[PDB]
Amino acid sequence: PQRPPVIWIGAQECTGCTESLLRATHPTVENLVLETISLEYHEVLSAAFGHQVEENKHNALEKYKGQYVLVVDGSIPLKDNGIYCMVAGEPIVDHIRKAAEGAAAIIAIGSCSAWGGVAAAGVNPTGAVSLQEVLPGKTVINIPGCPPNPHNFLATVAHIITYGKPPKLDDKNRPTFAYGRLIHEHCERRPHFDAGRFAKEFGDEGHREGWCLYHLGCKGPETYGNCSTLQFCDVGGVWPVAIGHPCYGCNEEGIGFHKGIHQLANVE
Amino acid sequence: SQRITIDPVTRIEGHLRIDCEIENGVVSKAWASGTMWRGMEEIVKNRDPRDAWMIVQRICGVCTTTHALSSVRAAESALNIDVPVNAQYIRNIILAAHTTHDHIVHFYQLSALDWVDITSALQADPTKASEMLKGVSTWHLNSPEEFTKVQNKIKDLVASGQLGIFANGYWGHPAMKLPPEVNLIAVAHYLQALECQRDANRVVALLGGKTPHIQNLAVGGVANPINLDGLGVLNLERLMYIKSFIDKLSDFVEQVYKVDTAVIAAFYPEWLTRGKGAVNYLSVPEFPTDSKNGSFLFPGGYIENADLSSYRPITSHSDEYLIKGIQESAKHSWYKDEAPQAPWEGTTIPAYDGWSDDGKYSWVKSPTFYGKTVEVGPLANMLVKLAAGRESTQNKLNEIVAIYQKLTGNTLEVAQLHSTLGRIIGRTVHCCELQDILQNQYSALITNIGKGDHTTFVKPNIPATGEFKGVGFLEAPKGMLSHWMVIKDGIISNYQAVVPSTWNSGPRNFNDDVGPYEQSLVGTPVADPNKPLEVVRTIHSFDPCMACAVH
Numbered sequence: 001p002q003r004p005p006v007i008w009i010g011a012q013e014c015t016g017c018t019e020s021l022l023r024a025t026h027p028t029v030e031n032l033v034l035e036t037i038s039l040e041y042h043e044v045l046s047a048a049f050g051h052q053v054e055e056n057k058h059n060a061l062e063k064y065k066g067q068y069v070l071v072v073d074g075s076i077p078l079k080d081n082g083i084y085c086m087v088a089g090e091p092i093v094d095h096i097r098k099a100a101e102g103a104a105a106i107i108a109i110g111s112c113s114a115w116g117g118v119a120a121a122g123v124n125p126t127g128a129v130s131l132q133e134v135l136p137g138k139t140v141i142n143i144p145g146c147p148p149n150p151h152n153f154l155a156t157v158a159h160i161i162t163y164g165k166p167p168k169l170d171d172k173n174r175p176t177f178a179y180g181r182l183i184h185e186h187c188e189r190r191p192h193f194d195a196g197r198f199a200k201e202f203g204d205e206g207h208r209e210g211w212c213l214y215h216l217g218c219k220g221p222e223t224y225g226n227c228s229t230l231q232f233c234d235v236g237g238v239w240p241v242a243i244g245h246p247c248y249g250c251n252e253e254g255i256g257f258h259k260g261i262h263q264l265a266n267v268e
Numbered sequence: 269s270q271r272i273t274i275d276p277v278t279r280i281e282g283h284l285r286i287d288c289e290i291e292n293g294v295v296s297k298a299w300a301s302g303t304m305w306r307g308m309e310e311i312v313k314n315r316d317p318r319d320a321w322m323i324v325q326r327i328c329g330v331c332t333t334t335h336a337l338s339s340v341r342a343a344e345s346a347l348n349i350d351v352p353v354n355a356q357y358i359r360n361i362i363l364a365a366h367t368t369h370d371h372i373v374h375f376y377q378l379s380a381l382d383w384v385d386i387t388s389a390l391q392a393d394p395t396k397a398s399e400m401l402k403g404v405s406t407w408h409l410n411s412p413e414e415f416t417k418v419q420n421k422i423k424d425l426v427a428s429g430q431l432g433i434f435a436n437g438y439w440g441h442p443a444m445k446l447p448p449e450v451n452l453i454a455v456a457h458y459l460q461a462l463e464c465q466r467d468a469n470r471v472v473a474l475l476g477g478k479t480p481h482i483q484n485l486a487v488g489g490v491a492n493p494i495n496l497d498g499l500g501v502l503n504l505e506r507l508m509y510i511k512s513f514i515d516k517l518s519d520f521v522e523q524v525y526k527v528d529t530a531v532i533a534a535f536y537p538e539w540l541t542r543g544k545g546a547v548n549y550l551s552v553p554e555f556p557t558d559s560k561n562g563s564f565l566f567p568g569g570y571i572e573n574a575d576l577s578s579y580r581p582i583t584s585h586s587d588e589y590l591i592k593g594i595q596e597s598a599k600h601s602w603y604k605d606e607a608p609q610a611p612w613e614g615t616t617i618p619a620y621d622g623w624s625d626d627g628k629y630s631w632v633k634s635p636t637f638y639g640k641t642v643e644v645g646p647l648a649n650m651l652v653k654l655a656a657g658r659e660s661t662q663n664k665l666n667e668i669v670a671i672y673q674k675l676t677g678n679t680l681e682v683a684q685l686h687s688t689l690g691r692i693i694g695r696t697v698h699c700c701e702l703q704d705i706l707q708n709q710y711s712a713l714i715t716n717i718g719k720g721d722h723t724t725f726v727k728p729n730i731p732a733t734g735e736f737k738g739v740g741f742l743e744a745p746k747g748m749l750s751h752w753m754v755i756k757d758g759i760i761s762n763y764q765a766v767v768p769s770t771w772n773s774g775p776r777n778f779n780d781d782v783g784p785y786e787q788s789l790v791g792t793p794v795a796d797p798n799k800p801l802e803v804v805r806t807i808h809s810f811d812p813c814m815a816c817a818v819h
């Protein structure tokens with residue numbers, strides 16, 4: 001049978017959001033590209049290069065007009081008329097706006113495309129912005145994290161394929177199944193927070209008993225996500241706090257890449 | 269002539285003793301004995317009906333899930349509750365995936381060492397072994413390289429001098445007929461089976477909350493919260509994860525287990541002519557798919573005197589013909605009340621007095637159906653599906669017969685299925701057909717959630733006066749299971765389990781008639797009475813579970 005088409009364009013990306021797919025199990029990346037979707041453009045895996053791969057992009061945008069999912073990782077740099085990311089001699093913002101015209105659905109995978117992320121932090125050398133800022137007339141689905149668990153992306157695509165619409169979204173256009181709750185409102189160390197049982201430094205007695213990481217700078221009280229429940233890598237028990245380090249807030253604009261690791265969060 | 273005892277029987281669940289009189293080199297008479305009792309029916313008495321399933325699940329951890337499901341069905345029967353269809357899809361996926369694990373582990377970990385000589389595998393040529401399977405299997409892990417790695421693990425274990433659970437085995441016995449190459453193929457498949465059964469139990473875990481001993485049931489439905497858009501509940505990501513494990517099971521079942529079944533029959537063809545335990549068979553229908561506890565995917569029925577053409581179909585778990593026929597006796601069992609009892613009126617009063625050949629010799633009761641002895645389990649199940657004209661069952665049996673024909677030049681007729689190898693074949697056919705059950709019920713769940721039905725639970729009410737009787741039927745891996753609950757003044761006043769290994773392992777009955785294990789052994793050739801491998805081969809074909817049989 002025919003498979004649903006996907007076009008993937010990277011802007012100011014580190015490739016970590018593509019690499020999340022190589023950890024996925026349901027589906028694995030091989031079952032994603034042979035069974036679930038037709039990946040029509042993705043520069044990390046493509047056999048074709050150069051003028052051949054730019055022809056196959058143009059052919060797919062025509063063939064599948066109105067039908068494809070467009071995915072972008074990385075921020076989009078507006079400073080100095082787009083020149084901080086140039087592909088085939090043109091600003092990446094022009095390739096993204098052209099591909100958005102014919103898309104059936106548009107997804108910002110990762111904090112960089114969702115809200116600017118690390119690339120837009122500090123002084124913001126390149127005038128980096130989000131995918132939604134570049135496409136003001138379109139509904140962009142945001143899947144933040146640095147990178148997210150890959151299944152936060154894969155189960156969003158599956159809902160579009162299987163049931164013919166996107167999952168339910170919050171007021172930042174994030175899927176509720178993955179981003180509907182604060183990490184601290186579903187964290188297994190909340191009993192320790194409640195009792196005043198805190199780690200004070202890495203390797204101390206409370207740290208070595210799995211106590212709450214609030215006084216090490218945990219950003220769980222101010223970060224929406226599923227890191228404590230879905231966790232990572234499908235082996236069981238693996239997320240930053242379970243390994244012994246505070247949440248940094250990488251999902252959440254104004255927290256990750258802004259606040260220091262050891263700066264304390266506000267508590268509701 | 270002489271008398272032998274096999275105690276313990278190993279590579280079963282629980283505690284079994286088998287006695288045999290041998291005359292002129294053949295078993296002339298046998299006794300089956302369950303040697304451990306707990307009193308699980310008495311432990312659950314006087315409790316709230318909603319609590320029973322968590323207690324009686326612990327009748328058995330090999331057939332985990334089964335007593336849990338039968339118990340909620342029994343309370344739902346007494347109370348007149350219709351289970352939500354989503355709760356049926358979830359219960360069905362759990363039972364089908366559990367039963368896949370159970371049958372694979374029985375064929376490989378429990379039974380294979382009756383037929384396979386691990387020492388002989390050290391003499392095999394790995395290349396010749398791989399060449400034997402060309403045009404017989406498409407399995408991707410039959411290479412010479414795989415078989416050489418397996419042979420080297422056997423070589424290392426032997427060289428250590430610590431054989432442990434592989435020691436003092438039946439190596440070189442005259443009833444061991446496989447060539448060295450086929451012994452090495454079987455050991456490689458034994459190890460590969462452990463990966464497939466682990467995948468099957470990952471399906472069970474994601475819906476049950478763990479395994480062994482699931483924790484997602486309720487009188488009224490299930491505890492899983494269906495919400496595609498919810499964090500921390502049964503959402504689309506969790507359903508995709510379940511599907512990733514369902515899809516891993518088929519290739520091993522079809523290309524390894526199904527093919528090995530035909531190969532064992534090709535090397536042991538006289539085992540198609542012995543081990544008949546009964547002439548009557550019973551199975552119940554299974555996998556309900558409607559909103560009113562019916563519309564089963566697999567059929568049930570009753571066969572009398574081995575006549576498939578005149579069988580009686582069973583299409584409902586409320587069938588009064590099935591309900592009214594079932595009784596149990598304790599004449600030759602260690603309980604006080606001996607006359608046949610309908611389970612709603614059953615007692616379980618212990619009366620141990622030691623072993624007597626003509627008196628009491630087991631903790632297992634003796635069940636009958638309108639006064640007759642009956643075999644349950646995969647041979648019953650397969651023969652009822654063939655009587656019903658079920659084309660899926662016909663076709664799967666035909667695939668096993670076609671491999672046997674290619675290997676031997678001989679065919680297999682239905683008369684040859686009433687035997688130790690026919691029983692083994694019925695189990696394999698069931699495991700194969702269950703893979704379609706899993707695909708069907710996963711698709712049904714996804715489609716129903718998409719129509720906007722997220723319902724999973726109907727909260728029960730239990731009147732504080734009145735007497736209510738309920739029965740929960742289930743087609744378990746070992747055969748028809750029933751749990752019988754009486755409710756009086758809001759609490760359990762009687763609880764009786766009649767379990768498939770009770771039917772097959774129970775001792776002589778109120779009329780001194782012989783049950784299936786004891787009948788199956790008459791005529792068994794025994795080359796060495798000190799090492800009675802031939803007896804253990806026939807008994808293992810029934811998949812004994814003595815925690816189940818006695819409870």
Ligand code: SF4
Pocket residue numbers: 012013014015016017073074109110111112113117118145146147
């Ligand atoms: S969101 Fe994080 S992992 Fe993804 S492109 Fe940006 S820096 Fe890399």
Ligand code: SF4
Pocket residue numbers: 183184187188189190191193211212213214218219220221241247
């Ligand atoms: S501060 Fe962090 S570690 Fe402590 S309970 Fe909240 S989310 Fe968990």
Ligand code: FCO
Pocket residue numbers: 328331334335744745746747749767768769770812813816817
């Ligand atoms: N299958 C199984 Fe256990 C037995 N006998 C039950 O029910």
Ligand code: F3S
Pocket residue numbers: 145146223225227239240241246247248249250251252
């Ligand atoms: S740093 Fe990021 S990965 Fe989760 S635990 Fe905190 S939102």
Ligand SMILES: [Cl-]
Pocket residue numbers: 494495496497717722
């Ligand atoms: Cl839903």
Ligand SMILES: [Mg+2]
Pocket residue numbers: 309633764765766767818819
């Ligand atoms: Mg009983």
Ligand code: NI
Pocket residue numbers: 281328329330331332813815816
């Ligand atoms: Ni059991």
